[PDB]
Design a protein around this motif. Structure first.
Motif, PDB file in Angstrom:
ATOM      1  N   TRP A  29     106.708  37.659 -13.954  1.00  0.00           N
ATOM      2  CA  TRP A  29     106.142  38.209 -15.174  1.00  0.00           C
ATOM      3  C   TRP A  29     104.627  38.184 -15.084  1.00  0.00           C
ATOM      4  CZ3 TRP A  29     110.485  35.248 -17.814  1.00  0.00           C
ATOM      5  CH2 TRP A  29     111.470  36.135 -18.264  1.00  0.00           C
ATOM      6  N   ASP A  30     104.091  37.076 -14.576  1.00  0.00           N
ATOM      7  CA  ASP A  30     102.647  36.932 -14.405  1.00  0.00           C
ATOM      8  C   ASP A  30     102.153  38.014 -13.457  1.00  0.00           C
ATOM      9  OD1 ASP A  30      99.963  35.921 -13.673  1.00  0.00           O
ATOM     10  OD2 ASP A  30     100.637  34.039 -14.572  1.00  0.00           O
ATOM     11  N   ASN A  31     102.904  38.213 -12.379  1.00  0.00           N
ATOM     12  CA  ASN A  31     102.588  39.236 -11.391  1.00  0.00           C
ATOM     13  C   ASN A  31     102.646  40.608 -12.052  1.00  0.00           C
ATOM     14  OD1 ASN A  31     102.561  39.901  -8.172  1.00  0.00           O
ATOM     15  ND2 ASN A  31     103.826  41.378  -9.275  1.00  0.00           N
ATOM     16  N   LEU A  32     103.652  40.804 -12.903  1.00  0.00           N
ATOM     17  CA  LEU A  32     103.813  42.056 -13.632  1.00  0.00           C
ATOM     18  C   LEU A  32     102.636  42.252 -14.577  1.00  0.00           C
ATOM     19  CD1 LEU A  32     107.634  42.109 -14.467  1.00  0.00           C
ATOM     20  CD2 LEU A  32     106.403  43.664 -12.938  1.00  0.00           C
ATOM     21  N   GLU A  33     102.156  41.150 -15.151  1.00  0.00           N
ATOM     22  CA  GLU A  33     101.004  41.190 -16.046  1.00  0.00           C
ATOM     23  C   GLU A  33      99.790  41.649 -15.253  1.00  0.00           C
ATOM     24  OE1 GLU A  33     101.285  40.296 -19.713  1.00  0.00           O
ATOM     25  OE2 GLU A  33     103.115  40.972 -18.724  1.00  0.00           O
ATOM     26  N   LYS A  34      99.667  41.139 -14.031  1.00  0.00           N
ATOM     27  CA  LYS A  34      98.574  41.522 -13.149  1.00  0.00           C
ATOM     28  C   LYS A  34      98.668  43.019 -12.872  1.00  0.00           C
ATOM     29  CE  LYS A  34      98.237  37.114 -10.630  1.00  0.00           C
ATOM     30  NZ  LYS A  34      99.270  36.180 -11.151  1.00  0.00           N
ATOM     31  N   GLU A  35      99.871  43.462 -12.517  1.00  0.00           N
ATOM     32  CA  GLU A  35     100.123  44.866 -12.233  1.00  0.00           C
ATOM     33  C   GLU A  35      99.773  45.724 -13.438  1.00  0.00           C
ATOM     34  OE1 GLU A  35     103.834  45.907 -10.445  1.00  0.00           O
ATOM     35  OE2 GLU A  35     103.936  44.086  -9.230  1.00  0.00           O
ATOM     36  N   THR A  36     100.296  45.349 -14.600  1.00  0.00           N
ATOM     37  CA  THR A  36     100.032  46.088 -15.825  1.00  0.00           C
ATOM     38  C   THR A  36      98.551  46.049 -16.189  1.00  0.00           C
ATOM     39  OG1 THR A  36     101.061  44.216 -17.006  1.00  0.00           O
ATOM     40  CG2 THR A  36     102.281  46.289 -16.938  1.00  0.00           C
ATOM     41  N   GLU A  37      97.885  44.935 -15.886  1.00  0.00           N
ATOM     42  CA  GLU A  37      96.457  44.801 -16.154  1.00  0.00           C
ATOM     43  C   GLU A  37      95.695  45.857 -15.370  1.00  0.00           C
ATOM     44  OE1 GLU A  37      95.121  43.652 -18.838  1.00  0.00           O
ATOM     45  OE2 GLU A  37      93.706  42.293 -17.858  1.00  0.00           O
ATOM     46  N   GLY A  38      96.008  45.956 -14.084  1.00  0.00           N
ATOM     47  CA  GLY A  38      95.374  46.949 -13.245  1.00  0.00           C
ATOM     48  C   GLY A  38      95.776  48.344 -13.677  1.00  0.00           C
ATOM     49  N   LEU A  39      97.065  48.505 -13.968  1.00  0.00           N
ATOM     50  CA  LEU A  39      97.610  49.781 -14.407  1.00  0.00           C
ATOM     51  C   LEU A  39      96.998  50.220 -15.729  1.00  0.00           C
ATOM     52  CD1 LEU A  39     101.395  49.512 -13.437  1.00  0.00           C
ATOM     53  CD2 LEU A  39      99.626  50.901 -12.345  1.00  0.00           C
TER      54      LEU A  39
ATOM     55  N   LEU B 135      93.292  52.526  -5.887  1.00  0.00           N
ATOM     56  CA  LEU B 135      93.390  51.766  -4.645  1.00  0.00           C
ATOM     57  C   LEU B 135      92.872  50.352  -4.833  1.00  0.00           C
ATOM     58  CD1 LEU B 135      92.533  54.234  -1.730  1.00  0.00           C
ATOM     59  CD2 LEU B 135      94.664  52.973  -2.093  1.00  0.00           C
ATOM     60  N   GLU B 136      91.783  50.206  -5.580  1.00  0.00           N
ATOM     61  CA  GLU B 136      91.215  48.891  -5.839  1.00  0.00           C
ATOM     62  C   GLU B 136      92.202  48.041  -6.621  1.00  0.00           C
ATOM     63  OE1 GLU B 136      87.242  48.575  -7.363  1.00  0.00           O
ATOM     64  OE2 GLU B 136      86.467  50.075  -5.960  1.00  0.00           O
ATOM     65  N   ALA B 137      92.827  48.649  -7.622  1.00  0.00           N
ATOM     66  CA  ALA B 137      93.818  47.956  -8.426  1.00  0.00           C
ATOM     67  C   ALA B 137      95.017  47.614  -7.551  1.00  0.00           C
ATOM     68  CB  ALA B 137      94.235  48.806  -9.615  1.00  0.00           C
ATOM     69  N   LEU B 138      95.397  48.557  -6.693  1.00  0.00           N
ATOM     70  CA  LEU B 138      96.508  48.360  -5.774  1.00  0.00           C
ATOM     71  C   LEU B 138      96.158  47.328  -4.704  1.00  0.00           C
ATOM     72  CD1 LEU B 138      98.110  51.884  -5.218  1.00  0.00           C
ATOM     73  CD2 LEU B 138      98.882  50.001  -6.673  1.00  0.00           C
ATOM     74  N   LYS B 139      94.866  47.123  -4.477  1.00  0.00           N
ATOM     75  CA  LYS B 139      94.410  46.138  -3.510  1.00  0.00           C
ATOM     76  C   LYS B 139      94.419  44.765  -4.161  1.00  0.00           C
ATOM     77  CE  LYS B 139      91.499  49.142  -0.656  1.00  0.00           C
ATOM     78  NZ  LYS B 139      90.114  49.436  -0.200  1.00  0.00           N
ATOM     79  N   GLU B 140      93.926  44.712  -5.393  1.00  0.00           N
ATOM     80  CA  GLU B 140      93.892  43.475  -6.158  1.00  0.00           C
ATOM     81  C   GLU B 140      95.313  43.026  -6.456  1.00  0.00           C
ATOM     82  OE1 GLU B 140      91.168  41.422  -8.103  1.00  0.00           O
ATOM     83  OE2 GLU B 140      90.739  41.887  -6.007  1.00  0.00           O
ATOM     84  N   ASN B 141      96.082  43.929  -7.050  1.00  0.00           N
ATOM     85  CA  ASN B 141      97.469  43.654  -7.390  1.00  0.00           C
ATOM     86  C   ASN B 141      98.309  43.564  -6.131  1.00  0.00           C
ATOM     87  OD1 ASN B 141      96.931  43.666 -10.164  1.00  0.00           O
ATOM     88  ND2 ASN B 141      97.325  45.864 -10.336  1.00  0.00           N
ATOM     89  N   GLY B 142      97.913  44.305  -5.102  1.00  0.00           N
ATOM     90  CA  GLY B 142      98.634  44.280  -3.842  1.00  0.00           C
ATOM     91  C   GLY B 142      98.460  42.950  -3.149  1.00  0.00           C
TER      92      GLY B 142
END
Ligand code: PCW
Ligand code: PCW
Ligand code: PCW
Ligand code: PCW
Ligand code: PCW
Ligand code: PCW
Ligand code: PCW
Ligand code: PCW
Ligand code: PCW
Ligand code: 17F
Ligand code: 17F
Lengths: 198, 198
Positions: A29-39, B135-142
């Motif tokens: 969920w935390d990871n998803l939060e990170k993903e959604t944050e970037g998204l 890409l930056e978000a995908l890099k951070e989240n990646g």
């Protein structure tokens, strides 16, 4: 029996699975939060930029459509006139052909169908005479074959009864010890198999 | 003995069947002879009234076919001319239509494709910035994903080994005894199977 012990291991498996469903799932969920944050940043910039670009894109495209639609309209309008004149000409050209060729085709049909009338009439009549002889032959041979079939059927029936009589009796006579031996065989087998199911 | 005595019952049927097949083929041949006899005289008349009479049939149809073809050709010449003349006008009209249509289409393309060039360029260029943001978000989240997933993977592996070693031992402690029991059951079953019909 041992299934109870093995299921206990499954219980440990479930517990071990639940342990993973704890920190791991929470981190997911935390990871998803990170993903959604970037998204969120991506979507925001995307949506805003899409709306900003979609305006000149669509509006300029609308202009393309205008030049194309108005352009095509000014192309189809004169083309339609030429096409209609050409089509009407084609229709006239064809009609001026369909009339003489139609008359011809009709006369051709007359000369063909009428010929067919006087060609098929004798043909069918001839066929009637031929088919009559054919039918007569089929009757001559048919009546004969009917007697032959009946005669051979009688002989074959006799060869069937002369076979069925001893075959049935022998089959029954053999079926007696056979069914009994099979019964014994099954009785022994079933009694042994039950010991495996117990 | 079953397949022996029963076979004799079939053999006696086959032999006696041939005893009937003999006259059957002879009588069938006799009837076929009469059939072919009638058909012989029939074909003598049939083919006669078909071929000898097909001559006047074809001779009649040929006259019409000739006139049909001749009249058709006689029509084709002027008709093809009419079609060609009409087509020439239509084609020439199209020639004088395709010129402005094509030229204007080319000019419209200068306001279509050429205008799109000055539009797609900044759009794609800006897309490069958008791609960078994504890409930056995908890099951070990646990178986070890789870290988070790796951490979860290790926790999965640790709990997996707990279900790979102790659990396997539990399975071994089941497979071994179970195999022994199953072997006992199989040994007796396979043995009892051949103790009835073998
Ligand atoms: C400058 C800007 C540029 C960038 C932007 C452009 C991007 C393109 C736009 C969007 C991307 C779409 C991807 C997201 C997927 C959507 C998921 C979703 O939210 O989904 C729910 C919708 C519900 O429908 P709705 O009522 O809201 O929409 C009808 C619209 N109304 C109400 C508004 C007027 O579901 C649907 O849209 C699907 C309908 C389900 C129908 C299934 C039956 C299919 C039948 C046959 C299969 C045919 C295969 C043929 C292909 C050929 C193979 C050879
Ligand atoms: C590019 C430049 C622009 C040019 C564009 C031209 C486009 C043509 C436009 C519109 C067509 C009209 C729509 C017809 C729809 C009917 C469909 C149907 O229901 O259709 C079956 C019927 C049955 O027939 P019926 O008499 O029992 O019914 C009579 C029934 N009621 C009352 C309808 C008359 O048909 C009928 O109605 C009649 C159908 C048969 C038509 C025969 C006439 C043909 C004319 C000239 C000869 C052309 C030969 C060229 C092709 C050569 C190929 C090698
Ligand atoms: C219960 C009633 C059943 C019918 C039978 C009647 C009663 C028994 C009477 C006489 C039997 C005498 C023996 C006939 C000779 C057997 C030849 C033979 O070995 O045969 C078996 C083969 C089987 O194929 P394969 O696996 O060897 O070949 C594979 C080919 N490879 C290797 C190239 C891939 O089959 C062939 O050769 C093709 C078929 C040859 C069998 C002819 C039997 C005809 C019997 C009655 C019809 C009557 C007609 C008379 C009426 C007149 C009407 C105008
Ligand atoms: C009651 C009528 C009896 C027929 C019953 C069915 C009704 C349909 C009516 C008529 C059609 C006649 C059909 C006869 C054709 C036989 C076909 C056949 O079974 O072909 C095989 C045989 C055996 O040789 P093979 O295949 O091992 O060798 C060749 C080697 N390869 C295969 C290995 C590579 O080959 C041969 O017989 C070789 C010669 C085949 C002869 C072809 C010409 C037929 C022309 C006229 C038939 C006249 C019937 C008139 C009777 C009047 C009744 C009122
Ligand atoms: C009432 C009257 C009373 C009775 C009187 C008795 C008279 C009987 C009448 C007529 C006698 C006919 C027998 C003639 C026998 C020999 C025919 C022949 O000379 O034979 C060989 C030809 C060769 O051709 P080739 O290509 O080898 O030579 C290429 C050569 N080049 C360049 C020269 C043309 O072969 C051909 O003429 C055959 C090629 C055409 C066949 C195409 C097959 C298409 C497949 C299926 C048809 C499906 C229809 C479906 C129906 C469903 C409806 C619902
Ligand atoms: C403005 C909107 C933005 C979009 C971006 C702008 C791009 C447009 C730019 C240039 C035009 C190209 C696009 C047309 C479609 C491509 C056709 C094509 O791939 O062409 C090349 C092929 C070559 O094959 P090959 O023999 O070398 O390969 C055989 C061996 N192998 C296959 C293994 C390699 O064919 C040939 O060169 C033979 C000739 C075929 C020519 C077809 C072109 C037709 C034109 C327009 C499409 C129809 C519009 C209709 C609407 C009507 C409105 C009234
Ligand atoms: C009312 C309806 C609404 C619709 C609205 C329309 C809006 C249009 C919007 C946007 C268009 C912007 C396009 C950007 C222009 C540059 C495209 C590009 O980057 O162009 C160069 C590439 C590179 O060529 P290559 O070395 O990779 O290919 C090797 C080909 N070989 C094997 C034949 C030798 O060429 C390619 O990708 C093309 C060659 C590969 C063939 C792809 C399949 C084409 C299918 C049909 C014909 C259409 C052609 C239209 C052009 C499509 C461009 C995507
Ligand atoms: C959500 C929380 C719940 C708890 C979950 C606990 C699960 C444990 C989780 C993670 C630990 C294991 C992860 C490590 C997996 C390896 C990934 C990998 O390194 O991958 C790439 C490799 C490369 O191989 P290559 O293709 O390049 O070489 C082909 C060879 N040639 C060219 C050389 C000859 O691939 C391979 O090692 C191929 C390996 C294929 C293994 C497939 C097994 C998948 C397991 C379960 C899927 C279940 C689906 C259930 C159904 C649900 C429906 C709704
Ligand atoms: C009232 C009662 C009546 C009384 C009568 C007694 C019963 C009569 C019963 C049966 C009729 C006879 C047929 C059985 C004969 C055994 C066939 C068999 O078994 O011959 C072994 C082969 C093994 O391979 P190979 O040695 O030929 O090759 C060597 C390959 N090289 C060179 C790469 C090393 O077998 C194969 O080829 C095919 C594999 C067949 C699968 C066997 C099970 C394997 C176990 C687990 C795998 C899961 C299978 C799941 C499917 C469901 C099954 C219900
Ligand atoms: C050694 C000899 C060897 C000889 C071998 C010969 C070979 C024989 C081969 C095959 C014969 C079997 C042939 C079976 C044919 C199947 C026929 C069939 O489909 O029947 C229907 C039933 C349906 O059950 P469901 O009733 O629960 O109903 C709901 C249904 N699905 C629905 O959607 O509404 O499905 C069922 O059978 C399941 C219900 C079972 C009830 C249990 C009933 C219990 C039955 C028996 C128990 C005996 C043991 C008693 C001791 C127990 C100890 C505690
Ligand atoms: C507590 C219980 C625990 C259970 C424990 C079970 C353990 C059982 C023990 C041993 C099992 C043995 C497992 C052996 C696996 C070996 C697989 C393998 O690579 O086999 C080799 C063969 C042959 O290769 P070759 O290169 O020799 O080909 C021959 C050559 N081309 C020729 O022309 O001569 O390949 C083939 O022909 C294809 C075979 C594919 C196999 C299918 C494999 C199918 C795999 C997976 C199926 C997915 C099922 C998922 C189910 C989940 C739901 C619950």
């Amino acid at each position: 029996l041992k299934l109870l012990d093995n299921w206990d291991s499954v219980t440990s498996t479930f517990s071990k699975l639940r342990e993973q469903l704890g920190p791991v799932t929470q981190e997911f969920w935390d990871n998803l939060e990170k993903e959604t944050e970037g998204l969120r940043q991506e979507m925001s910039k995307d949506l805003e930029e899409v709306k900003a670009k979609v305006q000149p894109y669509l509006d300029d495209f609308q202009k393309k459509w205008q030049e194309e639609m108005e352009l095509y309209r000014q192309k189809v309008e004169p083309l339609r006139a030429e096409l209609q004149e050409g089509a009407r000409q084609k229709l006239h050209e064809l009609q001026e052909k369909l009339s003489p060729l139609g008359e011809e085709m009709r006369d051709r049909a007359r000369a063909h169908v009428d010929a067919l009338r006087t060609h098929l009439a004798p043909y069918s009549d001839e066929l009637r005479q031929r088919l009559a002889a054919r039918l007569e032959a089929l009757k001559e041979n048919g009546g004969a074959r009917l007697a032959e079939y009946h005669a051979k059927a009688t002989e074959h029936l006799s060869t069937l009864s002369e076979k069925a009589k001893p075959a049935l009796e022998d089959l029954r006579q053999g079926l007696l010890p056979v069914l009994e031996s099979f019964k014994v065989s099954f009785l022994s087998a079933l009694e042994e198999y039950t010991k495996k199911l117990n």
